[PDB]
Design an enzyme around this catalytic site. Structure first.
Site, PDB file in Angstrom:
ATOM      1  N   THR A   1     -13.133   3.706   2.633  1.00 53.59           N
ATOM      2  CA  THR A   1     -12.051   4.672   2.639  1.00 53.59           C
ATOM      3  C   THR A   1     -10.729   3.940   2.341  1.00 53.59           C
ATOM      4  O   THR A   1      -9.961   4.366   1.489  1.00 53.59           O
ATOM      5  CB  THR A   1     -11.988   5.397   4.020  1.00 53.59           C
ATOM      6  OG1 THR A   1     -13.246   6.050   4.303  1.00 53.59           O
ATOM      7  CG2 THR A   1     -10.851   6.421   4.118  1.00 53.59           C
ATOM      8  N   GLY A   2     -10.460   2.833   3.045  1.00 53.90           N
ATOM      9  CA  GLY A   2      -9.217   2.087   2.811  1.00 53.90           C
ATOM     10  C   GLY A   2      -9.074   1.637   1.375  1.00 53.90           C
ATOM     11  O   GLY A   2      -7.947   1.582   0.862  1.00 53.90           O
TER      12      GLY A   2
ATOM     13  N   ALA B   1      -8.493   0.861   9.564  1.00 52.15           N
ATOM     14  CA  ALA B   1      -7.407  -0.160   9.671  1.00 52.15           C
ATOM     15  C   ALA B   1      -6.009   0.487   9.586  1.00 52.15           C
ATOM     16  O   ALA B   1      -5.128   0.241  10.459  1.00 52.15           O
ATOM     17  CB  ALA B   1      -7.560  -1.269   8.607  1.00 52.15           C
TER      18      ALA B   1
ATOM     19  N   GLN C   1      -5.357   2.668  12.830  1.00 58.28           N
ATOM     20  CA  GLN C   1      -5.103   1.858  14.042  1.00 58.28           C
ATOM     21  C   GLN C   1      -3.789   1.081  13.938  1.00 58.28           C
ATOM     22  O   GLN C   1      -3.047   1.004  14.902  1.00 58.28           O
ATOM     23  CB  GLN C   1      -6.301   0.954  14.401  1.00 58.28           C
ATOM     24  CG  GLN C   1      -7.548   1.779  14.707  1.00 58.28           C
ATOM     25  CD  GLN C   1      -8.763   1.025  15.275  1.00 58.28           C
ATOM     26  OE1 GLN C   1      -9.564   1.636  15.986  1.00 58.28           O
ATOM     27  NE2 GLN C   1      -8.939  -0.269  14.931  1.00 58.28           N
TER      28      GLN C   1
ATOM     29  N   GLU D   1     -16.959  -6.247   1.089  1.00 60.49           N
ATOM     30  CA  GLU D   1     -15.485  -6.222   1.094  1.00 60.49           C
ATOM     31  C   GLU D   1     -14.824  -6.814  -0.157  1.00 60.49           C
ATOM     32  O   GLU D   1     -13.883  -6.206  -0.655  1.00 60.49           O
ATOM     33  CB  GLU D   1     -14.875  -6.755   2.426  1.00 60.49           C
ATOM     34  CG  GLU D   1     -15.168  -5.830   3.607  1.00 60.49           C
ATOM     35  CD  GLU D   1     -14.445  -6.201   4.896  1.00 60.49           C
ATOM     36  OE1 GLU D   1     -15.088  -6.255   5.947  1.00 60.49           O
ATOM     37  OE2 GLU D   1     -13.221  -6.387   4.899  1.00 60.49           O
TER      38      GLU D   1
ATOM     39  N   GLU E   1      17.067  -2.963  -1.581  1.00 62.45           N
ATOM     40  CA  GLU E   1      17.909  -3.988  -2.155  1.00 62.45           C
ATOM     41  C   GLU E   1      17.204  -5.347  -2.138  1.00 62.45           C
ATOM     42  O   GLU E   1      17.298  -6.116  -3.113  1.00 62.45           O
ATOM     43  CB  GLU E   1      19.263  -4.006  -1.416  1.00 62.45           C
ATOM     44  CG  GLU E   1      20.330  -4.869  -2.063  1.00 62.45           C
ATOM     45  CD  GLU E   1      21.667  -4.766  -1.356  1.00 62.45           C
ATOM     46  OE1 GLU E   1      22.230  -3.656  -1.271  1.00 62.45           O
ATOM     47  OE2 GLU E   1      22.152  -5.808  -0.877  1.00 62.45           O
TER      48      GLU E   1
ATOM     49  N   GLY F   1     -12.541  -1.677   3.522  1.00 61.58           N
ATOM     50  CA  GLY F   1     -13.256  -0.479   3.925  1.00 61.58           C
ATOM     51  C   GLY F   1     -13.505   0.416   2.732  1.00 61.58           C
ATOM     52  O   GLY F   1     -12.797   0.310   1.732  1.00 61.58           O
TER      53      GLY F   1
HETATM   54  N1  LIG Z   1      -5.913  -5.910  11.179  1.00 65.22           N
HETATM   55  C1  LIG Z   1      -6.874  -4.935  11.263  1.00 65.22           C
HETATM   56  N2  LIG Z   1      -7.917  -4.922  10.404  1.00 65.22           N
HETATM   57  C2  LIG Z   1      -8.842  -3.928  10.541  1.00 65.22           C
HETATM   58  C3  LIG Z   1      -8.718  -2.902  11.580  1.00 65.22           C
HETATM   59  N3  LIG Z   1      -9.758  -2.057  11.472  1.00 65.22           N
HETATM   60  C4  LIG Z   1     -10.517  -2.503  10.445  1.00 65.22           C
HETATM   61  N4  LIG Z   1      -9.969  -3.607   9.911  1.00 65.22           N
HETATM   62  C5  LIG Z   1     -10.474  -4.366   8.761  1.00 65.22           C
HETATM   63  O1  LIG Z   1     -10.694  -3.461   7.689  1.00 65.22           O
HETATM   64  C6  LIG Z   1     -11.840  -3.852   6.935  1.00 65.22           C
HETATM   65  C7  LIG Z   1     -12.854  -2.689   7.033  1.00 65.22           C
HETATM   66  O2  LIG Z   1     -12.206  -1.469   6.665  1.00 65.22           O
HETATM   67  P1  LIG Z   1     -11.937  -0.198   7.623  1.00 65.22           P
HETATM   68  O3  LIG Z   1     -10.483   0.180   7.513  1.00 65.22           O
HETATM   69  O4  LIG Z   1     -12.497  -0.426   8.991  1.00 65.22           O
HETATM   70  O5  LIG Z   1     -12.893   0.858   6.889  1.00 65.22           O
HETATM   71  P2  LIG Z   1     -12.510   2.331   6.468  1.00 65.22           P
HETATM   72  O6  LIG Z   1     -11.194   2.306   5.714  1.00 65.22           O
HETATM   73  O7  LIG Z   1     -12.505   3.175   7.705  1.00 65.22           O
HETATM   74  O8  LIG Z   1     -13.700   2.650   5.473  1.00 65.22           O
HETATM   75  P3  LIG Z   1     -15.241   3.049   5.905  1.00 65.22           P
HETATM   76  O9  LIG Z   1     -15.388   2.995   7.396  1.00 65.22           O
HETATM   77  O10 LIG Z   1     -16.077   2.265   5.000  1.00 65.22           O
HETATM   78  O11 LIG Z   1     -15.302   4.482   5.427  1.00 65.22           O
HETATM   79  C8  LIG Z   1     -12.315  -5.165   7.581  1.00 65.22           C
HETATM   80  O12 LIG Z   1     -11.747  -6.263   6.832  1.00 65.22           O
HETATM   81  C9  LIG Z   1     -11.796  -5.059   9.012  1.00 65.22           C
HETATM   82  O13 LIG Z   1     -11.488  -6.294   9.651  1.00 65.22           O
HETATM   83  C10 LIG Z   1      -7.555  -2.979  12.470  1.00 65.22           C
HETATM   84  O14 LIG Z   1      -7.360  -2.102  13.384  1.00 65.22           O
HETATM   85  N5  LIG Z   1      -6.730  -3.987  12.231  1.00 65.22           N
HETATM   86 MG   LIG Z   2     -14.174   3.878   8.710  1.00 59.93          MG
HETATM   87 MG   LIG Z   3      26.771  -2.959  -2.482  1.00 59.43          MG
END
Ligand SMILES: Nc1nc2c(ncn2[C@@H]2O[C@H](COP(=O)(O)OP(=O)(O)OP(=O)(O)O)[C@@H](O)[C@H]2O)c(=O)[nH]1
Ligand SMILES: [Mg+2]
Ligand SMILES: [Mg+2]
Ligand SMILES: Nc1nc2c(ncn2[C@@H]2O[C@H](COP(=O)(O)OP(=O)(O)O)[C@@H](O)[C@H]2O)c(=O)[nH]1
Ligand SMILES: COc1ccc(N(C)c2cc(=O)oc3ccccc23)cc1O
Ligand SMILES: [Ca+2]
Lengths: 428, 440
Positions: free
Chosen positions: B145-146, B12, B15, B183, B254, B143
């Site tokens: 990682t996220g 996420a 991208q 999630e 600010e 995610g």
């Molecule tokens: N708005 C938006 N949400 C995203 C995108 N890609 C993934 N998500 C959301 O992110 C969540 C899943 O996490 P990801 O970021 O895909 O996973 P990751 O951080 O790569 O972690 P793992 O793949 O488990 O290692 C879900 O709620 C998805 O809908 C994107 O490009 N845009």
């Molecule tokens: Mg991933």
């Molecule tokens: Mg000022």
């Protein structure tokens, strides 16, 4: 007592400061390069109060420019009279103060203050007989407010027998940058009460309302506000700058205007009220000046003069007019309103005249009042302080810089004391 | 100075990062190779856009940005795509194994293997700054990682940079485009872990963005690309104050003074207007009053919640394009006599306003109409706590049965980390209640 040292701190401080120097340089015949091109001897006789003489033969403002951020000062340097300032007197850091009094006073400002005092010292050493200091700053931000008050305390330590004078811009919700302004102002007022001899309360509320109600500017800018500030500042310093029948300095102002050392916060006023651009052709009569200069709508501090009493008033009339008619009108307004002037200070209204009018006017009147009604300003700030402080809202911005809540409680109490100290003399 | 470093974590984050940097390049006239013809100071400078781009001697403008993922296939697309020359290869960092939608793997098992290298690369960017202001961190809550890697990095950044500011853009999960059933777990774990380490966090509810693409742009089934284009506009609005200069420009820092009354109360609600198709924008000009009004329509919010049923602690309006204060003030005065805008009693009611003059840009082949003027409102409302209540409830449903918990335990975590995280969330919801109660 000849030389004044001028200091301008922070965004507001430097913006009103630059405008003051534009205006007074014009009045004194000085141009952006420092060259005298005027035709009156009155312009030069007391020019040493504000200007240094370089062998040039150039006139250099005795002005130190201070900020924790470069932006506003770069703007001063490329502004109209930008080249006139001694480049060594630009003292600036890089980080800014984030509208935070603690950053200005304790952390970021502390880092820069010594180099400002070095510049202060070099100017002070070159003085025949230093009167003292004037500082322009706002109370609502971080640099003018926290660092400005830090400077004042350090200036007092090194020069305890010189006068300290400020033009202090008070914040208003009507013209507001951040919610923390009342915190920054209360912390600052606490400092001003202890370490200045005289302070002009320049209230952004009043400046706004004048621009809106009187000047019919539906959406006032800082530029419009500053037009009023620079006209007022020119007016209040007339008797320091020009030879007259009363020859004033910062100490004589303080002796005659301040009956009790804490009550040193002045309400300034100006007439006729004008804007930049569209200006009146209709000349003012001495009765009209006098009536207008005393009107609540002409005051630069948003307080009602009728809700208090004047301890002392100094009034300055500029232009060719009848000094006889001035004296008559001034006496008239006192004799017809004498319940608003304390009866236990005889002759507490003093008038002075100068022949040189300001730019674009045939005649003007400037008002300096020490009124007990100024308590309204401090009460307003106090209410705003308490509204947040009762829930400790926004306090982490200050505790993060090492301050404790005790320091807020103490500054609030001291400002409330000031208020009831005013109320004390309004009854007797 | 003052430089900002962006860190894009996981799919996420990466991208959204693509969409943001592409749009920044368009807004500043930076070409895909990094060349910017209008920039006359070669190899350096302290212009507004230098907060986000450094400069090479060869005239290349390079994002102050690191992209990190525990798996290589999303970042590989940056490496081989349109904007591949923008980034030095060392800014794009990938492991081999992902977190498999598991916070424990992102934070511990897999995350710990790459964390020192990530901090090395971040350090390399920080050393090129003359006055680093702080970090902008982009990631999903959902995610592995996220959630897990981001919380590890935030903790490490606090150690290595002290109180240097850290801001988040955090993707809050929705059913319509979610990827994992776990999630809610990952969301609560990162939120608890990160809370003390973040100064301000902008949550973006995927369901709010999904709805907006459906209703306002007539997209039947929005993809990540549709969502991200919209998200990047909102991100661009927030960072515009850092990247451009102008007399009425007001610095993001600010706004932050007003938006964060207590360290934990740091989650502004973003609302954006106008979002409109080319078809509907044709011959229909949306004025300052119209777009300002649209800020108080809950359908335009980045997080689904109802501010009409909460209290405000701050309101900021960030305008871009053809907008003068006179019109803003008029629009505000109208709104203030017509809307459900109740403030808590300890905060002043004035709206804080900034205007940047550069108009909104749109990416070619996109869905958004090019408009003359746009606005992002940032409010601090007690209503944002609804989003926590919904997520905490989903967490509770599963956790009461310990469903899926063994996947976390198996990677080294304990039950006590779940209950501790959850309690911090209960205390947060409680905090949002307390700030809304009248003073005595
Ligand atoms: N708005 C938006 N949400 C995203 C995108 N890609 C993934 N998500 C959301 O992110 C969540 C899943 O996490 P990801 O970021 O895909 O996973 P990751 O951080 O790569 O972690 P793992 O793949 O488990 O290692 C879900 O709620 C998805 O809908 C994107 O490009 N845009
Ligand atoms: Mg991933
Ligand atoms: Mg000022
Ligand atoms: N009258 C006037 N007020 C100003 C000006 N600039 C800022 N202010 C006010 O000053 C306060 C903020 O302080 P500022 O000087 O910007 O911050 P600093 O640079 O940290 O000292 C607020 O109350 C603003 O309304 C100005 O040019 N004129
Ligand atoms: C109940 O929630 C979920 C179940 C599975 C998955 N994943 C990762 C899948 C893995 C796969 O190999 O085949 C799939 C086919 C269709 C849908 C999902 C999967 C994700 C989820 O949220
Ligand atoms: Ca350059």
């Amino acid at each position: 007592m000849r030389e004044i040292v001028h200091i301008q701190a922070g965004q507001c401080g430097n913006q009103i400061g630059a405008k003051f120097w534009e205006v007074i340089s014009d009045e004194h015949g000085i141009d952006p390069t420092g060259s005298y091109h005027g035709d009156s001897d009155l312009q030069l006789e007391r020019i040493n109060v504000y200007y240094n003489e370089a062998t040039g033969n150039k006139y250099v403002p005795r002005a130190i420019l201070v900020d924790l951020e470069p932006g506003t000062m770069d703007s001063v340097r490329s502004g109209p009279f930008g080249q006139i300032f001694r480049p060594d007197n630009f003292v600036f850091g890089q980080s800014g103060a984030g509208n935070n009094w603690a950053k200005g006073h304790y952390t970021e400002g502390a880092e820069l203050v010594d180099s400002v005092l070095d510049v202060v010292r070099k100017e002070s050493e070159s003085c025949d007989c230093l009167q003292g200091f004037q500082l322009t700053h706002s109370l609502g931000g971080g640099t003018g407010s926290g660092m400005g008050t830090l400077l004042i305390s350090k200036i007092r330590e090194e020069y305890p027998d010189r006068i300290m004078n400020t033009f202090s811009v008070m914040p208003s919700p009507k013209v507001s940058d951040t919610v923390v302004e009342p915190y920054n102002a209360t912390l600052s007022v606490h400092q001003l009460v202890e370490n200045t001899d005289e302070t002009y309360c320049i209230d952004n509320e009043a400046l706004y309302d004048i621009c809106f109600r009187t000047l019919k500017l539906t959406t006032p800018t800082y530029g419009d506000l500053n037009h009023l500030v620079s006209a007022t500042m020119s007016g209040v310093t007339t008797c320091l700058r020009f030879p007259g029948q009363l020859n004033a300095d910062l100490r004589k102002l303080a002796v005659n205007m301040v009956p009790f050392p804490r009550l040193h916060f002045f309400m300034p006023g100006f007439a006729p009220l004008t804007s930049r651009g569209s200006q009146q052709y209709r000349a003012l009569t001495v009765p009209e000046l006098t009536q207008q200069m005393f009107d609540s709508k002409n005051m630069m501090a948003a307080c009602d003069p009728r809700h208090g009493r004047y301890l002392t008033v100094a009034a300055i009339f500029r232009g060719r007019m009848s000094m006889k008619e001035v004296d008559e009108q001034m006496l008239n307004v006192q004799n017809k309103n004498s319940s608003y002037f304390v009866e236990w200070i005889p002759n507490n209204v003093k008038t002075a005249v100068c022949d040189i009018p300001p730019r674009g006017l045939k005649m003007s009147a400037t008002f300096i009042g020490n009124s007990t009604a100024i308590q309204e300003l401090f009460k307003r700030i106090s209410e705003q302080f308490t509204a947040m402080f009762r829930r400790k809202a926004f306090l982490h911005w200050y505790t993060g810089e090492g301050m404790d809540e005790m320091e807020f409680t103490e500054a609030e109490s001291n400002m409330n004391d000031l208020v009831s100290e005013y109320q004390q003399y309004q009854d007797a | 100075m003052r430089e900002c470093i962006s860190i894009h974590v996981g799919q996420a984050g990466v991208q959204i990062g693509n969409a943001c940097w592409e749009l920044y390049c368009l807004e500043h006239g930076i070409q895909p190779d990094g060349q910017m013809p209008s920039d006359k100071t070669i190899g350096g400078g302290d212009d507004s856009f230098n907060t986000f781009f450094s400069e090479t001697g060869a005239g290349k403008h390079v994002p102050r940005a690191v992209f990190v993922d525990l798996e290589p296939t999303v970042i590989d697309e940056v490496r081989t795509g349109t904007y591949r020359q923008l980034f030095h290869p060392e800014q794009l960092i990938t492991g081999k194994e992902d977190a498999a939608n598991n916070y424990a793997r992102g934070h511990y098992t897999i995350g710990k293997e790459i964390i020192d290298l990530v901090l090395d690369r971040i350090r390399k960017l920080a050393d090129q700054c003359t006055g680093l202001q702080g970090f902008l961190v982009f990631h999903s809550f959902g995610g592995g990682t996220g959630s897990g890697f981001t919380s590890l990095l935030m903790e490490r950044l606090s150690v290595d940079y002290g109180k240097k500011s850290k801001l988040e853009f955090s993707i809050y999960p929705a059913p319509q485009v979610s990827t994992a059933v776990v999630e809610p777990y990952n969301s609560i774990l990162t939120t608890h872990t990160t809370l003390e380490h973040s100064d301000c966090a902008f949550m973006v509810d995927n369901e709010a963005i999904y709805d907006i693409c459906r209703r306002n742009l007539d997209i039947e089934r929005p993809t990540y690309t549709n969502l991200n284009r919209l998200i990047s506009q909102i991100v661009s609005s927030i960072t515009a104050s850092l990247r451009f200069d102008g007399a009425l420009n007001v610095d993001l820092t600010e706004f932050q003074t007003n938006l964060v009354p207590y360290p934990r109360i740091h989650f502004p609600l973003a609302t954006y207007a106008p979002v409109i198709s080319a078809e509907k924008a044709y011959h229909e000009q949306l004025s300052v009053a119209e777009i300002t009004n649209a800020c108080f329509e809950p359908a335009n919010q980045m997080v689904k919640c109802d501010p009409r049923h909460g209290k405000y602690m701050a309101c900021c309006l960030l305008y871009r394009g053809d907008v003068v204060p006179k019109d803003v003030n008029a629009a505000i005065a109208t709104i203030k006599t017509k809307r459900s805008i109740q403030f808590v009693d300890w905060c002043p009611t004035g709206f804080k306003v900034g205007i940047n003059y550069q108009p909104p840009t749109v990416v070619p082949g996109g869905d958004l109409a090019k408009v003359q003027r746009a606005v992002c409102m940032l409010s601090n409302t007690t209503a944002i706590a609804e989003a926590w209540a919904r997520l905490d409830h989903k967490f509770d449903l599963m956790y009461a049965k310990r469903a899926f918990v063994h996947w976390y335990v198996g990677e080294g975590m304990e039950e006590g980390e779940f209950s501790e995280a959850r309690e911090d969330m209960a205390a947060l919801e409680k905090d949002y209640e307390e700030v809304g109660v009248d003073s005595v």
